[PDB]
Assembly symmetry: D2
Homo-oligomer: 123 residues x 4
């Protein structure tokens, strides 16, 4: 993958959360996520995908991943997806927007989904 080495490793967002990811040659993303906020403790599995052959015109690298907020410690009955792009270079970043859906009754489904934005850096 063009940015396999750029993406693989440890990232931190503006909340102080930790994203540990391995990028595969094929486009796979596998790792763990630890949230600094919310009803979450320790690491959660993540999986996702990235564009392993991005444009060479200075565009970012599209990618996304999911965490279901169940691990051996806690189950928040919810899942977050991040959708964004990796930008390489001196100050490498992953710029994302996210959707956090909680399981709800049908009556409460209108209030099931939070939306936000996270920026991940290497420091």
């Amino acid at each position: 993958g063009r940015d396999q080495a750029g993406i693989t490793g440890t990232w931190y967002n503006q909340l102080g959360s930790t994203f540990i990811v391995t990028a595969g040659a094929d486009g796979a993303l596998t790792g763990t996520y630890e949230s600094a906020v919310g009803n979450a403790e320790s690491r959660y599995v993540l999986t996702g995908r990235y564009d392993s052959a991005p444009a060479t015109d200075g565009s970012g690298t599209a990618l996304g991943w999911t965490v279901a907020w169940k691990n051996n410690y806690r189950n928040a009955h919810s899942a977050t997806t991040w959708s964004g792009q990796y930008v390489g270079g001196a100050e490498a970043r992953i710029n994302t927007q996210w959707l956090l859906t909680r399981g709800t009754t049908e009556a409460n489904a209108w209030k099931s989904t939070l939306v936000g934005h996270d920026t991940f850096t290497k420091v």
Copy 2:
């Protein structure tokens, strides 16, 4: 997983797209996605996560998945994430919202991300 058998199989959305997924006991989602719309042809790999131990109070099952829009046919330099819940029973559904990020230059990043909603059924 509580809804491992409920989620596993073939789903169709309101656009006529086809989502083929296998749910693992652990919370894994793996499969293929074929979009009826957009700069897409044939099947794309997907991966995601679901809550393998949902609430028993009639709430849905939180889940999410990602497609990077690169396969052997086409590369749209973009990724979609769906975030939603599975609702079991006579008319089983997966109700989602999605974020579609395209790789962009920094100047164009304000117009990188589409948002929408898809409802998947078994027929």
Copy 3:
């Protein structure tokens, strides 16, 4: 406005909420909103804007509006914006996506904003 008469009047969404709007020649939207769900009672003021000279190529009419959830009865310390398009004809509709922001502390701002979708019809 091209759709001034089409938009003006009473609309109902899938939750059973009631949207009463007047469209001005200039692009203004003014009216009241009554939510069937949530910490809301009676009517709330709304204001917004629409495209008073839409494309003639069968495209919808872009529009948006805001409700702050304060009236003489209740104050939820929150605001919803709907962004969407009006589609005229036998089954006229306003198809929207919405963002509902609650006032929060800085620590809680990551969970300030819900996202959803509403479809309004004339019946």
Copy 4:
């Protein structure tokens, strides 16, 4: 309004856009928006709403507004809504997420809506 004087005036976002707003005692927002980016020239009318009696517990002030991208110069057949909160004090800010809907045919409605985030400051 509690933050009538705090909100009223000129704001700038991270793109270099200019938001000029007057907050009314009642909860009204009226002003003009000038985008630094996109198919936009000069000022566009905006209208919105804010919570005129926010919580006194250090929470932000919920607010929203709409611009339809039609003025005497250009018509992009689209509308943006910003949903967010005002945070007062030394470094006052309005933190928003936005939805930008373009008028589309029914076939293209899946790609009608962009989502992003803008932060406005007084300098």
